[PDB]
Amino acid sequence: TTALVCDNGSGLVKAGFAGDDAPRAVFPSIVGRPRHQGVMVGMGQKDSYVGDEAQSKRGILTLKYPIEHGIITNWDDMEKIWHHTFYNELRVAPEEHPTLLTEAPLNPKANREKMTQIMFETFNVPAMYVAIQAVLSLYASGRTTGIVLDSGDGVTHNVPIYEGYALPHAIMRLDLAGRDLTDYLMKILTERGYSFVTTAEREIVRDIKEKLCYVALDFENEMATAASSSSLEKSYELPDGQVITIGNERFRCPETLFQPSFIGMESAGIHETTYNSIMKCDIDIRKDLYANNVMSGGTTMYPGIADRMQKEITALAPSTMKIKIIAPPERKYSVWIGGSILASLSTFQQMWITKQEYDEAGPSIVHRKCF
Amino acid sequence: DEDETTALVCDNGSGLVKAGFAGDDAPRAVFPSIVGRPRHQGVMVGMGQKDSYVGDEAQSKRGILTLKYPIEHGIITNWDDMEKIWHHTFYNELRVAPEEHPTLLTEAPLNPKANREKMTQIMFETFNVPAMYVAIQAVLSLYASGRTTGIVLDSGDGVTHNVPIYEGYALPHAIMRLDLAGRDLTDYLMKILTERGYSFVTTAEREIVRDIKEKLCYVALDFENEMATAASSSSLEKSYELPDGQVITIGNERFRCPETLFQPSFIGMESAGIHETTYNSIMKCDIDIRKDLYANNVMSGGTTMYPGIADRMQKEITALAPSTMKIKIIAPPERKYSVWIGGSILASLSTFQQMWITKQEYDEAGPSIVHRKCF
Amino acid sequence: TTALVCDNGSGLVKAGFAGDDAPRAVFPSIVGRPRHQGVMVGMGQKDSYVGDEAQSKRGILTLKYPIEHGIITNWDDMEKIWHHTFYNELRVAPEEHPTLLTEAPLNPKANREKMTQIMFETFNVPAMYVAIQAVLSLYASGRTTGIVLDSGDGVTHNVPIYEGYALPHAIMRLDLAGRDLTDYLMKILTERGYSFVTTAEREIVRDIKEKLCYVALDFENEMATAASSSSLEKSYELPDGQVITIGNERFRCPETLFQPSFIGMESAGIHETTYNSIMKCDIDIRKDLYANNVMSGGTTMYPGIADRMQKEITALAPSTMKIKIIAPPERKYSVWIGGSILASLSTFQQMWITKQEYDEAGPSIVHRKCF
Amino acid sequence: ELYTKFARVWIPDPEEVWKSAELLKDYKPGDKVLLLHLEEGKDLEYRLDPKTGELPHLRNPDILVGENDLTALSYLHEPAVLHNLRVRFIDSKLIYTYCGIVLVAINPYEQLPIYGEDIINAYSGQNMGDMDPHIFAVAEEAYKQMARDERNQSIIVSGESGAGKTVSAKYAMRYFATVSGSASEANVEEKVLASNPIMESIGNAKTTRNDNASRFGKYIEIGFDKRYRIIGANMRTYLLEKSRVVFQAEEERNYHIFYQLCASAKLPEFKMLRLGNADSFHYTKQGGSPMIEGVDDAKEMAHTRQACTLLGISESYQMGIFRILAGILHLGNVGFASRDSDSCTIPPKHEPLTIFCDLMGVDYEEMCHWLCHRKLATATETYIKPISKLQATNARDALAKHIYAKLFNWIVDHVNQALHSAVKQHSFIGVLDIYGFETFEINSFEQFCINYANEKLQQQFNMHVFKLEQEEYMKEQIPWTLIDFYDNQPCINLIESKLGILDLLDEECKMPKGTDDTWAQKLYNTHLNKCALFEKPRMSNKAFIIKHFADKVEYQCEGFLEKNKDTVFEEQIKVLKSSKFKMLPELFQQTAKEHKKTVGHQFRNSLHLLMETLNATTPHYVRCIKPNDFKFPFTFDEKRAVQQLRACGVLETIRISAAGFPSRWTYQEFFSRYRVLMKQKDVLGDRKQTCKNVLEKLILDKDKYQFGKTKIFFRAGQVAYLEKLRADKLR
Ligand SMILES: Nc1ncnc2c1ncn2[C@@H]1O[C@H](COP(=O)(O)OP(=O)(O)O)[C@@H](O)[C@H]1O
Ligand SMILES: Nc1ncnc2c1ncn2[C@@H]1O[C@H](COP(=O)(O)OP(=O)(O)O)[C@@H](O)[C@H]1O
Ligand SMILES: Nc1ncnc2c1ncn2[C@@H]1O[C@H](COP(=O)(O)OP(=O)(O)O)[C@@H](O)[C@H]1O
Ligand SMILES: Nc1ncnc2c1ncn2[C@@H]1O[C@H](COP(=O)(O)OP(=O)(O)O)[C@@H](O)[C@H]1O
Ligand SMILES: [Mg+2]
Ligand SMILES: [Mg+2]
Ligand SMILES: [Mg+2]
Ligand SMILES: [Mg+2]
């Protein structure tokens, strides 16, 4: 047997076998459904579409996300996404290979229970496991000690770890993530008359965000050069061939991670949650956490963010602390990588909830197995 | 001190402008925001048709002139024509020089920054106003409602918008602007009247369809039941005598038209219905104040003047919200002037007389001043 | 003259005149500051609000706590809180009546000195005094001998006393208090997807805590009945009308007082600190301390806590010793009542630190008076 | 030191107010205690302020305490000026006095015969400065100035109720008549005497301080021709209380006329008007004291009907005035039941409304509708709106205040019809019968408006005092810059200017969510730390403090907003103007602006018009003082008297005078008095040059005196110091 590994991303799924250097399958976790009717006799359409075949049919289909705020919203669509990965993408039976799945910290008990239930009761998996994203991206980084900030599409969590042991009193979950930056980007583009309203248009704004946006080192300075010099203005061809001009919004958008008041949150910025997590840890280990701030997840892939984060943490910490940030080249592929590492580990073969084990303790077997 | 250089107050409506002095109970001037231009040759040299006509003098020349709209989707499309509308208001209607009194103007939330800047510029550079101000319609219609807390649903000719407010403070993430408005209902009404062979193609004919819409249409309380009585009883067909003299029947369309506000799918939009946008904007607000917004749903603007709309809205919000919340809709008569009345109130306050962008302040700071003054 | 008496509580202030049966003023020690933008041009506006007028504007206001860990964090907020008590609430001139204040044992010397300075410098009090909360709640309990366990919002403390004399080496202060129980309650409600993030939402979780939670007499039994019978669940109505189901967490949140490991503390449970502080006393007096365990402060308002603390002290102490745990019904004001009694006694005029004593001897006169 | 052993001082008392005390020793500098001799014995010692070193007020010499003007005293302080009036009123029974320009009059509650033709003929043709102080002296000054300058004049009479303002105005009017003989063809004096009982019935009310007080500024013009002979008169009215018509304070009542109606309801003529009782009627029941002790309102209704009959207004019109007044109270009984969605309604056949509609000759259905609803007109359509219970009571009560004010003016037009003449006047003298400053432990909108009115009159007075002194300095060739001007316009500008106290009250009146507490919060935000004048109690947020000339006044914010409302819908005026009754079409014969002003904005309009009327005329000034509150003849009470002196504002004009150069004497009078001090070697061939030389030796500091072409001016206490040196040389 060769175990399967999959990260249940809130906007992007990754999948493959344990031992693969990279996820051999990757696609948007989107189900698209037609909002129109049939213009001809015959020509039978699908009832629903999955990932790339939904993205090629934008405007004809309305796009839905089966995951929101790091939790599952429709299990019938998650069963559709899972079927796709096993047979319509990896071309492999889930009855032959064990499966590692992943979830965020502070996730509802019912979400984990229903996830393990569906994999045994529909995909008939021989054995399975569900692993926190943070520990996996820390294994991929390569440090037994380090606070890992995994900022994805629907979640952001600062999880401190020392000599392997995590500190559940210092972990911090944050709902601000890459989707809210996309929604804010639509508002600040509407100020220049570039309005957007459909979920198909939101995908174009998301491309624009990932291509052109970057984190300011000092917001006021970049606001002054945007107003005075205006050299930060850049063009973008839309599908229909129309050019739009974007500037200033390029730093105002991702600045929301340090200033959540832009979107009306009372919540602290990503640097403040990192500092406060270290301040909640034992005084003897703080120095080792300051030396090992690990960036993780796709919302950290903004230019300048590691230099700003280093400055912002250095301003909060004592001047004697060596503030060392580590941003793995592949911050995006880090959870999956660590999952395949824990999948090729021959000692982990004892931590697999078996099919028979599931039957013994209903759906809460995973809870005992984890804690 | 009965004399105050009494400020002028005007709502820049996308299909209907209103104007008057502060302290007037109602707008003393009101007319369609339409510029009409001749499309035919002079049968004589002494014809001398005005190059352009404005409002009522364009409407009295329908079919001979082609009607334009200087505003679309809530934003200005031709500033030369907006200069012509403004000139008309000052001397050809109110008979007053703009160099004497300050001017209050209005706009919809999420309006582009350049539209606000150019409106401020033209007032100070063409009309030479001593001082001016630009106000969001939602706070004005809330002054006219007379409560310090509520959610306003303002629906005009060219734009709709939701704005929740509490203790005089607003929530800039919970606001929701929608492009579905009274013009799209008029365009849909032409399409569904064409089902009975009643085709319409000119903007002069659109104006007759717009009258028909305002006179005969109403929001239903249960669409499926109203479709059943339209098909079975068939007592909904009202033969509207066309101005020309053509008695034309209008039946199921009297509700299919305004139902588009709750069902935007009729016109191919992915966007949610007006009730859903009012519910979601309450659900974006903090958990304590939601009960006070449910108790204070304010209807505003000329597209809300449909029979039955407040009772349908009350049911539609009650079906979404928890049953323990008392859902109240506020929908008094004459909601087409609520925004203006709120402007006339604001311009009459003593505490507002320091919040006037002066001609000197504009000359010193440049056109970006209107944004500093607001935020 | 009739002296003023006030408890500087970390989440709830109480105030009145000496001789009053109960504190005629009581309110949350919260300053509320705006978080939104005023869009009503020309309206009545305020800078910051205090207590009930902050609680009526929750959301629009963000909330602050001028006291944390039993110590003052901002004297500019405490100045406003004191101003409110004197002129806006009790409507009384502080230059007319003396002011008795309170504090927890092991409170910094600088905190007592700055509190003393403000009363004479800005409020111009004729005379004042600071009294340990423990001795006051023992006066309200009416015995000369007994160990008090005082547990408030921001601090918890053990103080053994015999023949009116404390044992300063035997006292035990603990940082676990009612605020940490509220913070843990948010985490265990998040296990059922009932997440909360604002300080205005934390006030609703705090109400939920005070209304529904209770101490189990046997945790392992209560966990078994929660899993098997599930009859312990209650539905609660949130401010927007929606109901949430709270069960199991109703005994888990206060159990943290006996099991501080839930929140990652190395510290012993409240019974173990009561046992250890009796074991620090002379063996001849322990019998009288076991016969007189006084419960005090608002966190001791959990159904079942007196019966548990008993089963727990009886399990640690010798079987020959008569274990008695007394809990005065009005525990929330026991400290205030003791202050109102103390300030009335003809034998207290010597303790009043006069303005002339402060002006001559400097702020450290407060320590000389106390010790 | 002036603190010797024969120089008496003044020591405070919580009863006698000021006791005289005689120095047992000569005070030395740095002495902390002073030994004194009271009228009860040498049993007192005095501890001097150990923080400021303050000594008690020195008494004036015995040659100065006997005069008819306070300006003749050297030391000018409250003990001395209160005592000067006291001894005159008690020993010499003197009622009149001067304070520079001001005449003061203390009410003797005893028939004085100083009003006989033989006194009038003795004063006539003589100088007012050679005569003793008297109403005749200020009346003949105004008459002389009218004839010499060809310019109109005005005498301002003011003080507390019961003080003699009405009484002094009658004596002034009698003189104006007798100085030009008589007007037997017109009988203006008899018609003025017939007007006052009906004017006070509609314009005065009972207050906690007095069984009868005027609530408005009464202004009478006396006309004369080229022969300066009296030919007729006119009655003007200003600053009338609007709130009184509807709202009553505790232990107070409405205008006396309303109760005259009520007590007379037993008579067959009033029985047809269906008048009931003062406990049933709303605008009257609120006060808790409908009837006045020792007064029968039915006897007052008999008197006012006789007074109307002497003025010649028809008995049919009298009954018409009564029918209207019965109507506006039935209107006050119309109560509105609350409805849903911010609405109200009236019961079917509501008996106060059926009686109102029958009395006023109007349709019930129209009156019921325009109160269950309201109109809203636009440029395209007219609409009808629901009206809340609170909006309906506010509209009803604004309507009741409006229609009473029109009825008042109608009655005043008939009073003018009796007083006027077909002969055109060549000139005229005004008499203004206005009130003093008003203060209590709790103050309302009424007290605010009364004090605002006093501040304007005070500005005119302050300016005049400076103007006359400046003219006297210029005539004596003495620099004007040596006198300082003390005004009160900052206290005026605080109230009526933009964002001032009154404009923020109008703003809170128009705003739909404005409140008494929101107005108080606006006042604390706008004026607390931006005006030292404005003050605020620390232990309350319900009150605010304003510095007024007489003293500071604390006002309770509650009620101000409600009382400022006066808006009434023009449709509610229209349905009463269409009345089948003959009077109502003539009561409401621009209105669209007037029917939307606030009470405060109407009051401002009225006051500014009166201020400019008094600015056109040459002003004269008299103060009326009430010496007690037991109404006992020649009984003087120091507590009442010092309060009166403060309300009349005279203690501040005496202070302005003292800060400048109060005492003044010609070189010859100075010589005659202090020639004893001069040696043969000191006296010259010119007494003026002698006095200039020796005064510079007697007083070394040059700011203590001022040398004129004819008279020497002196600072306070300097003439008393010369008299001390004169006495010290004799003994
Ligand atoms: N290079 C990039 N720059 C900026 N944002 C990015 C970039 N790459 C991905 N993102 C954003 O980050 C999110 C993807 O993070 P990811 O770790 O894939 O989340 P998940 O696994 O929950 O789907 C999306 O919101 C995406 O738009
Ligand atoms: N009584 C009515 N019934 C239905 N639609 C109406 C009615 N009155 C106006 N409308 C429509 O509402 C719009 C007018 O709204 P209005 O507030 O005047 O908009 P704007 O100010 O943007 O011009 C037009 O589309 C008009 O046809
Ligand atoms: N009935 C109750 N059950 C549980 N906790 C309570 C109860 N009443 C009060 N508390 C808690 O007690 C604390 C306040 O009590 P108090 O003695 O006034 O504290 P402090 O004086 O430190 O402010 C808060 O943490 C509050 O949540
Ligand atoms: N000079 C006076 N001599 C005698 N009585 C007087 C004199 N002045 C006033 N009074 C008395 O005062 C009362 C009338 O005063 P009046 O001027 O009517 O008061 P007011 O105008 O303040 O209400 C009567 O009792 C009257 O006898
Ligand atoms: Mg991720
Ligand atoms: Mg509009
Ligand atoms: Mg306590
Ligand atoms: Mg009188």
Author numbering:
A (entry chain C), C (entry chain D): 5 to 375
B (entry chain B): 2 to 376
D (entry chain A): 5 to 593, 626 to 767
Text from the published report:
Myosins are molecular motors that move or move along filamentous actin (F-actin). Myosins comprise a motor domain, which can be divided into four subdomains (N-terminal, upper 50-kDa (U50), lower 50-kDa (L50) and converter), a light chain-binding domain and a tail region. Primed myosin, with ADP and Pi bound, rebinds F-actin, leading to Pi release, cleft closure and generation of movement, proposedly through swinging of the lever (power stroke), towards the barbed end of F-actin (+actin)13 for most myosins. Here, to address these issues, we performed time-resolved cryogenic electron microscopy (cryo-EM)4 of a myosin-5 mutant having slow hydrolysis product release.
Our postPS actomyosin-5 structure shows a closed actin-binding cleft as well as a postPS lever position and has high similarity to previous structures of strongly bound actomyosin complexes (ADP-bound or rigor states). The cryo-EM density shows clear evidence for the presence of MgADP and we, therefore, identify the postPS state as ADP-bound actomyosin-5. We observe that the position of the lever is more similar to that observed in previous rigor structures, rather than ADP-bound structures. We also observe that the density for the magnesium ion in the nucleotide-binding pocket is in a different position to that seen in other ADP-bound structures. In the postPS state, the U50 domain is rotated such that the actin-binding cleft is closed and the HCM loop and loop 4 can interact with the actin surface, forming both hydrophobic and charged interactions, as seen in previous strongly bound actomyosin structures. These additional interactions increase the surface area of the binding interface from 375 Å2 in the primed state to 729 Å2 in the postPS state, creating a much stronger binding interface and providing the structural basis for the transition from weak to strong binding. In the postPS actomyosin structure, the interactions of loop 2 with actin subdomain 1 are different to those seen in the primed structure. Pseudo-atomic modelling suggests that interactions of H631 with acetyl-D1 and K629 with D24 are broken and the C-terminal portion of loop 2 adopts a helical conformation with K629 and K633 forming stronger ionic interactions with actin E2. Within the nucleotide-binding pocket, there are relative movements between switch 2, switch 1 and the P-loop that indicate that Pi has been released in the postPS structure. Here, by comparison of the primed and postPS actomyosin states, we definitively show that rotation of the U50 across the L50, resulting in cleft closure, displaces switch 1 and the P-loop away from switch 2 to open the backdoor and enable Pi release (see morph between primed and postPS actomyosin in Supplementary Video 3).
